[PDB]
Design an enzyme around this catalytic site. Sequence first.
Site, PDB file in Angstrom:
ATOM      1  N   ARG A  37       2.337  -5.648  -2.647  1.00  0.00           N
ATOM      2  CA  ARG A  37       3.084  -6.880  -2.885  1.00  0.00           C
ATOM      3  C   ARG A  37       4.386  -6.917  -2.112  1.00  0.00           C
ATOM      4  O   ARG A  37       4.714  -7.918  -1.552  1.00  0.00           O
ATOM      5  CB  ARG A  37       3.336  -7.070  -4.383  1.00  0.00           C
ATOM      6  N   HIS A  41       4.982  -9.769   0.644  1.00  0.00           N
ATOM      7  CA  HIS A  41       6.117 -10.693   0.487  1.00  0.00           C
ATOM      8  C   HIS A  41       7.157 -10.604   1.588  1.00  0.00           C
ATOM      9  O   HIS A  41       7.815 -11.554   1.886  1.00  0.00           O
ATOM     10  CB  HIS A  41       6.722 -10.578  -0.895  1.00  0.00           C
ATOM     11  N   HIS A 162      -5.595  -8.657  -4.510  1.00  0.00           N
ATOM     12  CA  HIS A 162      -5.478  -8.730  -5.984  1.00  0.00           C
ATOM     13  C   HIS A 162      -6.527  -7.772  -6.623  1.00  0.00           C
ATOM     14  O   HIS A 162      -6.631  -7.591  -7.849  1.00  0.00           O
ATOM     15  CB  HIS A 162      -5.638 -10.195  -6.472  1.00  0.00           C
ATOM     16  N   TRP A 178      -6.622  -8.280 -12.303  1.00  0.00           N
ATOM     17  CA  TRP A 178      -7.754  -9.012 -11.869  1.00  0.00           C
ATOM     18  C   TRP A 178      -9.039  -8.181 -12.059  1.00  0.00           C
ATOM     19  O   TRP A 178     -10.103  -8.748 -12.093  1.00  0.00           O
ATOM     20  CB  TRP A 178      -7.606  -9.281 -10.400  1.00  0.00           C
ATOM     21  N   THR A 179      -8.915  -6.860 -12.124  1.00  0.00           N
ATOM     22  CA  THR A 179     -10.061  -5.991 -12.142  1.00  0.00           C
ATOM     23  C   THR A 179     -10.023  -4.957 -13.235  1.00  0.00           C
ATOM     24  O   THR A 179      -8.996  -4.719 -13.814  1.00  0.00           O
ATOM     25  CB  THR A 179     -10.365  -5.309 -10.735  1.00  0.00           C
ATOM     26  N   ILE A 184      -7.881   0.940  -7.799  1.00  0.00           N
ATOM     27  CA  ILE A 184      -8.983   1.218  -6.853  1.00  0.00           C
ATOM     28  C   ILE A 184      -9.178   0.024  -5.954  1.00  0.00           C
ATOM     29  O   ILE A 184      -9.562  -1.038  -6.393  1.00  0.00           O
ATOM     30  CB  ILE A 184     -10.298   1.545  -7.605  1.00  0.00           C
ATOM     31  N   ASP A 207      -6.640 -18.155  -7.037  1.00  0.00           N
ATOM     32  CA  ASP A 207      -7.844 -17.361  -6.839  1.00  0.00           C
ATOM     33  C   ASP A 207      -9.041 -18.301  -7.006  1.00  0.00           C
ATOM     34  O   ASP A 207      -9.999 -18.285  -6.228  1.00  0.00           O
ATOM     35  CB  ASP A 207      -7.946 -16.256  -7.894  1.00  0.00           C
TER      36      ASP A 207
HETATM   37  C1  HEM Z   1      -3.208 -16.173  -1.907  1.00  0.00           C
HETATM   38  C2  HEM Z   1      -2.130 -16.583  -2.545  1.00  0.00           C
HETATM   39  C3  HEM Z   1      -1.467 -15.620  -3.493  1.00  0.00           C
HETATM   40  C4  HEM Z   1      -0.868 -15.972  -4.640  1.00  0.00           C
HETATM   41  C5  HEM Z   1      -0.754 -17.376  -5.219  1.00  0.00           C
HETATM   42  C6  HEM Z   1      -0.339 -14.757  -5.261  1.00  0.00           C
HETATM   43  C7  HEM Z   1       0.280 -14.681  -6.480  1.00  0.00           C
HETATM   44  C8  HEM Z   1       0.471 -13.490  -7.148  1.00  0.00           C
HETATM   45  C9  HEM Z   1       1.105 -13.446  -8.422  1.00  0.00           C
HETATM   46  C10 HEM Z   1       1.531 -14.712  -9.214  1.00  0.00           C
HETATM   47  C11 HEM Z   1       1.172 -12.176  -8.788  1.00  0.00           C
HETATM   48  C12 HEM Z   1       1.774 -11.651 -10.072  1.00  0.00           C
HETATM   49  C13 HEM Z   1       3.191 -11.057  -9.906  1.00  0.00           C
HETATM   50  C14 HEM Z   1       3.593 -10.410 -11.239  1.00  0.00           C
HETATM   51  O1  HEM Z   1       3.747 -11.173 -12.205  1.00  0.00           O
HETATM   52  O2  HEM Z   1       3.872  -9.177 -11.325  1.00  0.00           O
HETATM   53  C15 HEM Z   1       0.654 -11.339  -7.739  1.00  0.00           C
HETATM   54  C16 HEM Z   1       0.520  -9.964  -7.764  1.00  0.00           C
HETATM   55  C17 HEM Z   1      -0.009  -9.304  -6.707  1.00  0.00           C
HETATM   56  N1  HEM Z   1      -0.328  -9.790  -5.467  1.00  0.00           N
HETATM   57 FE1  HEM Z   1      -0.585 -11.769  -4.964  1.00  0.00          FE
HETATM   58  N2  HEM Z   1      -0.664 -13.707  -4.442  1.00  0.00           N
HETATM   59  C18 HEM Z   1      -1.346 -14.134  -3.355  1.00  0.00           C
HETATM   60  C19 HEM Z   1      -1.686 -13.403  -2.287  1.00  0.00           C
HETATM   61  C20 HEM Z   1      -1.557 -12.049  -2.194  1.00  0.00           C
HETATM   62  C21 HEM Z   1      -1.791 -11.323  -0.958  1.00  0.00           C
HETATM   63  C22 HEM Z   1      -2.156 -12.019   0.326  1.00  0.00           C
HETATM   64  C23 HEM Z   1      -1.671 -10.012  -1.246  1.00  0.00           C
HETATM   65  C24 HEM Z   1      -1.822  -8.837  -0.288  1.00  0.00           C
HETATM   66  C25 HEM Z   1      -2.810  -8.788   0.601  1.00  0.00           C
HETATM   67  C26 HEM Z   1      -1.308  -9.938  -2.675  1.00  0.00           C
HETATM   68  C27 HEM Z   1      -1.082  -8.828  -3.393  1.00  0.00           C
HETATM   69  C28 HEM Z   1      -0.750  -8.750  -4.656  1.00  0.00           C
HETATM   70  C29 HEM Z   1      -0.746  -7.516  -5.390  1.00  0.00           C
HETATM   71  C30 HEM Z   1      -1.139  -6.072  -4.999  1.00  0.00           C
HETATM   72  C31 HEM Z   1      -0.278  -7.880  -6.772  1.00  0.00           C
HETATM   73  C32 HEM Z   1      -0.081  -7.018  -8.007  1.00  0.00           C
HETATM   74  C33 HEM Z   1       1.324  -6.483  -8.057  1.00  0.00           C
HETATM   75  C34 HEM Z   1       1.553  -5.489  -9.192  1.00  0.00           C
HETATM   76  O3  HEM Z   1       0.583  -4.892  -9.677  1.00  0.00           O
HETATM   77  O4  HEM Z   1       2.728  -5.280  -9.580  1.00  0.00           O
HETATM   78  N3  HEM Z   1      -1.215 -11.242  -3.196  1.00  0.00           N
HETATM   79  N4  HEM Z   1       0.218 -12.155  -6.763  1.00  0.00           N
HETATM   80  K   LIG Z   2     -10.274  -2.941  -8.099  1.00  0.00           K
END
Ligand code: HEM
Ligand SMILES: [K+]
Length: 248
Positions: A37, A41, A162, A178-179, A184, A207
Amino acid sequence: GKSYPTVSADYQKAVEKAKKKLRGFIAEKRCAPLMLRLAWHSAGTFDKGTKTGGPFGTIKHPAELAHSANNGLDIAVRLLEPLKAEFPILSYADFYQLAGVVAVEVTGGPEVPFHPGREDKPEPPPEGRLPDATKGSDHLRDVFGKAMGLTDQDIVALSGGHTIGAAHKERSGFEGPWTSNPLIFDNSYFTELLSGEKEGLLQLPSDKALLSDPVFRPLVDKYAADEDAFFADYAEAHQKLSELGFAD
Ligand code: HEM
Ligand SMILES: [K+]
């Protein structure tokens, strides 16, 4: 279309050693998703028309960490600060992207190619460029396509990130993984999206938008059916993402 800059041998030696250290640190700390993330970002703010934003180290700035899309990432930055200090030669820009690459690797994901030489830039981009989870396909295209300049395929493959981690009600407001296996790296994000809402797993509206778009849906299906294909296209898209505005 990349031309990567030359960096000194000492800089390369530092990359290699940082990469190893990041593996061990990220694995022990269980923070791969957060580090993914953070890298995403950092890079995701790139605007192709103006060549502003992108993976140039600005996310370490309190002003950029304050963007609402970045809630929680101050944690990531603090976690990395002592390791980064061991590698003073490396740019923050390079360091955060390396940490994203390692995050993917150490959770069992593809090896995303990494090229050094990003410079730390002084001005964060304006807030508001990262995607809105409550929106859909058009919005995804506006952000990934018209701003960042990535492809429809890239949009779906990168959504697969995700596959690791979770939302938090105190950060975005959304909650949970999500999983069933959130440390993993696998194609489970697509298999879960396909099977419907199961209890205890998260699906953002963003999603869900993948399932109803004529271009995105065939990709979701491909990735759910074929993890090797997901890994190829994920590695291509992550590399591109990590290099937006860099080495053009
Ligand atoms: C496609 C549009 C996307 C949206 C709308 C989005 C939105 C979000 C949101 C709302 C969260 C939750 C943040 C939290 O409350 O802790 C999140 C977590 C996350 N996102 Fe996305 N995201 C997107 C794309 C991506 C991309 C492109 C990646 C990397 C390739 C990514 C990687 C992650 C990861 C790894 C988490 C989990 C973070 C954690 O476990 O603390 N996201 N995302
Ligand atoms: K997984």
